[PDB]
Structure formats: structure tokens, C-alpha cells
Design a protein around this ligand. Structure first.
Ligand SMILES: Nc1ncnc2c1ncn2[C@@H]1O[C@H](COP(=O)(O)OP(=O)(O)OP(=O)(O)O)[C@@H](O)[C@H]1O
Length: 290
């Protein structure tokens, strides 16, 4: 049905195909060239990173980095209420993910590894160089006690130094936003290869999912969920000694050059017969938008 193509925020209305309708001449809204609706087609595009090569420091740090961050999100879900179980049904509150990376299912371990690799490759394609400050930041295992019953079976508690001691700059928040953008785009392209397409209501048999939407249009709940996850990811990436310097805020306004067709402006004028050659005249112009 055609009602399934409505964008989430907008409401379905039946409006004139052309701009101008019947109204008062002084209330008539004169419109200029409208902007092109390129956003209508949600074509995700991740930043290309296959050509990029990982620097030596990150390629020998990542493996224990990858396992440590894996244990970090398994605690995040444990705090959220995740429970280990023999069965594979997450909705039934049973999953074998609590085990270590080696004991982890090979396909899950592979996922965690390309996502570590793609997070680092996105970090390095972001224009943000990262380097380790000192080895003491990794040598220190300053640890706060947490209840054993509330913790998992494994004695090694992945809970690192409390995150309040680390700080997140506006540039850090900016790169977290772009990293979340790239992760969303990659996931969307994955479902597109799977054959999934956008819909107003989720249909597993029809491969319809409302989340196949541009990130700015995405729901605030998944926005904040993925944003916080990548937030602890980046914060641990700093607390582990590796300091990173964001590119400075570069503001290059596009000035809305892109527009429908090649029209730059539209000119409105009275009829030539009303030309005034003498006298003193006055008329008003109202600016709806600056
Ligand atoms: N690392 C993970 N592996 C598997 N499931 C996860 C993981 N992290 C979270 N989940 C749970 O499974 C869901 C995975 O959905 P996601 O949008 O990431 O893609 P998907 O695996 O293709 O979809 P789904 O499992 O929902 O059909 C999450 O919404 C969450 O409930």
C-alpha cells in the first residue's frame, strides 16, 4: 500500500502538485527554486577503508584490545540484564556468549574481530591520528571491587577504571557521531545485500524494517544506544594509553548550491502595462524566510 512509503516524522497529506493555488494576492506565497530531494533515496555509503593499512602499534595492540572490549560489552549486557544459557535464544534469555573469545562461537568471534578492525579502520580513515602515550596506562590495573554474585563466572573482571576520570571533548563527541554514522551505514548495506528494504512496519518475511532509514531520521532510542556503546569504546581507546588528536572543526558551508534543475532563482514582476512613468509610488515586500 502507498501509505507505507511515508517518511517517519512527516504526515501523509494530499496537496496540490503545483506550487500556487487560489488565495488572496497579498497572502499568496511566492516560492523560489526548491532544493533537490536527494535524501529521498536512502543509499548508504560507508567510508572506504580496504586500501588503508593498519599501523604496527595498533595491529599488535588490537587482539588483546579486541578481547578486552568484547568482555567490556559482555559486561554492558550483563548490567542490562543479559544471562548466559546453553540455548541460543536471546529472547528466551539464554546464550553461550559469556565464555571467553576462544570458547566463543567462531562466527561470533569473527564478527567481533571485523567490527574491531572496522572501528579502528574508521578511526584511521576519520583523519584522526592515534598514538600510545605511555606503557604505564596499560600496566596499571587500578580496579574497583564488584560483587562476585553479580559478576560472571570468570575471575578476571573486565570492568576498567571508572570513566569519570577520562574526559570526552566536543571533538571526541563529533568523531563518535561519525563512527556511529559509519556503523549504521555498514549495517544498512549489509541488510541491503541480504535483500532487506525499508518499510513503515517491520515484516521479517517481506524483509521490511523501519530502521533502514538515514541516521538523522533514525529513532532516538537506537541512536543513543549505539552512541553510548561507541562512547565507551572510544573512551577505553583513550584510557588504554592511546591518545588521539581529532582534526580541527572545519566549517565549509555548502551554501545550498544543489537545487532542482539548474534554476538559481525565480523572478516575479507585475505586467508591463502597469509601468509608472510619473508620480510617487509605494509597495511592500514581506520576507517569510531570510
Ligand atoms: N553482538 C551481538 N550479536 C548478536 N546479537 C546481538 C549482539 N549485540 C546485540 N544483539 C542483540 O541482537 C540484535 C541484533 O540486531 P542488529 O540490528 O544488530 O542486526 P541483526 O543481528 O542482523 O538482527 P536481529 O538479530 O535483530 O534479527 C540487537 O538488537 C540486540 O537485541
Amino acid at each position: 500500500p502507498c501509505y507505507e512509503a511515508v517518511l517517519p516524522k512527516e504526515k501523509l497529506k494530499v496537496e496540490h502538485s503545483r506550487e500556487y493555488k487560489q488565495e488572496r494576492t497579498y497572502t499568496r506565497d511566492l516560492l523560489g527554486p526548491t532544493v533537490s530531494l536527494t535524501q529521498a533515496a536512502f543509499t548508504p555509503i560507508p567510508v572506504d577503508t580496504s586500501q588503508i593499512v593498519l599501523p604496527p602499534h595498533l595491529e599488535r595492540i588490537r587482539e588483546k584490545l579486541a578481547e578486552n572490549i568484547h568482555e567490556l560489552w559482555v559486561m554492558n549486557k550483563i548490567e542490562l540484564g543479559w544471562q548466559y544459557g546453553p540455548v541460543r535464544d536471546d529472547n528466551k534469555r539464554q546464550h553461550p556468549c559469556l565464555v571467553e573469545f576462544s570458547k566463543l562461537p567462531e562466527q561470533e568471534r569473527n564478527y567481533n574481530l571485523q567490527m574491531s578492525l572496522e572501528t579502528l579502520k574508521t578511526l584511521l580513515a576519520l583523519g584522526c591520528h592515534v598514538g600510545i602515550s605511555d606503557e604505564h596506562a596499560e600496566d596499571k590495573v587500578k580496579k574497583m571491587k564488584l560483587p562476585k554474585n553479580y559478576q560472571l563466572t570468570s575471575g578476571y573482571k573486565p570492568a576498567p577504571m571508572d570513566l569519570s576520570f577520562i574526559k570526552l571533548t566536543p571533538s571526541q563527541e563529533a568523531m563518535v557521531d561519525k563512527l556511529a554514522e559509519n556503523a549504521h551505514n555498514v549495517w544498512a548495506r549489509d541488510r541491503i545485500r541480504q535483500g532487506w528494504t525499508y518499510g513503515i512496519q517491520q515484516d521479517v518475511k517481506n524483509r521490511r524494517n523501519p530502521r533502514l532509514v538515514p541516521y538523522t531520521l533514525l529513532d532516538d532510542r537506537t541512536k543513543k544506544s549505539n552512541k553510548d556503546s561507541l562512547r565507551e569504546a572510544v573512551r577505553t581507546l583513550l584510557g588504554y594509553g592511546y591518545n588521539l588528536e581529532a582534526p580541527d572543526q572545519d566549517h565549509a558551508a555548502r551554501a545550498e548550491v544543489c537545487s532542482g534543475t539548474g534554476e538559481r532563482f525565480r523572478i516575479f514582476r507585475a505586467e508591463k502595462t502597469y509601468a509608472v512613468k510619473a508620480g510617487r509610488w509605494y509597495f511592500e515586500f514581506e520576507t517569510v524566510t531570510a
